[PDB]
Amino acid sequence: QSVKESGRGLVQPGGSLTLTCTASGFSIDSYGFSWVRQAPGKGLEHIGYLTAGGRAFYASWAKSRSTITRNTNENTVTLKMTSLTAADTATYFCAKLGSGNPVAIWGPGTLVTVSSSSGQPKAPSVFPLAPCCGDSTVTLGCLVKGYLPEPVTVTWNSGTLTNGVRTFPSVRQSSGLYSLSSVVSVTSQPVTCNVAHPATNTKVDKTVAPSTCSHH
Amino acid sequence: QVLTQTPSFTSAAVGGTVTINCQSSQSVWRNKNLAWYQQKPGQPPKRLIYAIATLDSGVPSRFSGSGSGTQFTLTISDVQCDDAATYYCVGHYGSENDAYYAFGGGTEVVVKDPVAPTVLIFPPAADQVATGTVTIVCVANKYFPDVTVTWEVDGTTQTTGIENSKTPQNSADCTYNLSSTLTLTSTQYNSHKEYTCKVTQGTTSVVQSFNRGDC
Amino acid sequence: AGXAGAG
């Protein structure tokens, strides 16, 4: 009883997006599924619904350039949208909404960046954050700069640090590239921030020294 | 606009009461298929209520749904920090051979408990400067209500180069955290000495500063 | 019918 979205996260205007929703723990023809999207800092908006019986219905704005499809062999439902503009940059969800029935099921979402002015995929440069060399409880962090597309995942000591761990929302920089930062409150351990960029299958591990001093 | 949700923004102290209303331009399927979703920034929405008034799993009793026909209401009593979120009504519509959904525009719910921030500043790592670009990071910890950030470089107020990013209200204490970054070229960074971030909440300012030569 | 469009 879960679904997971997958697909190319960096697309160009004029191109198309293709997003696949794969069901786990049940068969995807047991229920009707919707595609829903959320543009940055905007509300949820319904794209279309594939009924349990297999008919697709589209919102008026999406009708002409969207296609929702089902493959019961692979246990998937698929969204394709053409004639993309930057307005289509958004998080896309497949979901059984459960407006009136006990079962509701949402995927984690998949972040689609539509740009031709942002460049090509790019793995992040990871820089430690530490207080100035001019001085036991200290906040450290890592700046994850200049990646494309979203998302990155940041853990500290592989997730075993949790106290005062704060990972801030990414920001789309003027270059089209993304950046975020993450801080942790530490009190003696080698603290390591683990950064993963799934789109390029890149994993970085940066040990953060307690200060900017060169002697660490 | 099939579903008109009001208000767009509401606010309460811990233990207060919040009401959100949803007006539908036509009846929902079976006069029953209306649900309420809770979304926190950067997370998938969570279903609170379905079939107008049935609570989902993991939903506290202080959430209540009601209504009928074209009018629906969600109320939250004894509001808690974990209830800070954006709320959406979602309706199902159609006939025997047409089907669709509509979301309301959404209601931001802010839960109030005032706390003044502390501020840290992080000089650029040594390996940044060689790239031609350096990003200085200022963090405002654990605060409510919202703050403004000013950057000063040798007393000169910075008017561009800034990126601010805020964590949603903490589910335990209602507070925010803010990340503010100033980005400069390496030439510019090496041309200046004192870097200052000033965080202002109402009238109180908090300041944090470093000198490039010290780090 | 739990949803519309069931035909």
Numbering used by the authors:
A (entry chain H): 2 to 82, 82A, 82B, 82C, 83 to 100, 100A, 101 to 132, 136 to 187, ...
B (entry chain L): 2 to 27, 27A, 27B, 28 to 95, 95A, 95B, 95C, 95D, ...
C (entry chain D): 3 to 9
Q: What do the authors say?
A:
Phosphohistidine (pHis) is a labile posttranslational modification with two isoforms, 1-pHis and 3-pHis, involved in many cellular processes across the kingdoms of life. Previously, we developed monoclonal antibodies (mAbs) against the 1-pHis and 3-pHis modifications using stable phosphotriazolylalanine mimetics as immunogens. Here, we report structures of Fab fragments derived from five rabbit pHis mAbs crystallized in complex with their cognate 1-pTza and 3-pTza peptides. These structures provide critical information about the molecular mechanism of phosphoepitope recognition, isomer specificity, sequence independence, and noncross-reactivity to other phosphoamino acids.
In the 1-pHis Fabs the peptidyl phosphate is oriented toward the CDRH2 loop, whereas it is anchored on CDRH3 in the 3-pHis antibodies thus creating a deeper pocket. The peptide overlay of three 3-pHis antibody:peptide complexes shows that the phosphate binding is more conserved, with very low RMSDs, whereas the peptide has high degrees of freedom in binding. The elbow angles of the 3-pHis Fabs are between 142° and 150°, as measured by the RBOW server. The peptide interactions with these antibodies are mediated predominantly by the light chain. In contrast, the phosphate-binding site in the 3-pHis Fabs features the presence of a Gly in the phosphate-binding pocket that loosely recapitulates P-loop or Walker A motifs (GXXXX). The Gly makes hydrogen-bond interactions through its main-chain amide groups and also aids the neighboring amino acids in obtaining an optimal conformation for binding with the phosphate group. The N-terminal region of peptide interacts with Trp28, and Asn32 in CDRL1, whereas the C-terminal region is supported by residues in CDRL3 (His91, Ser94, and Glu95) and CDRH2 (Arg56). The peptide also binds to Thr52 in CDRH2 through one water molecule.
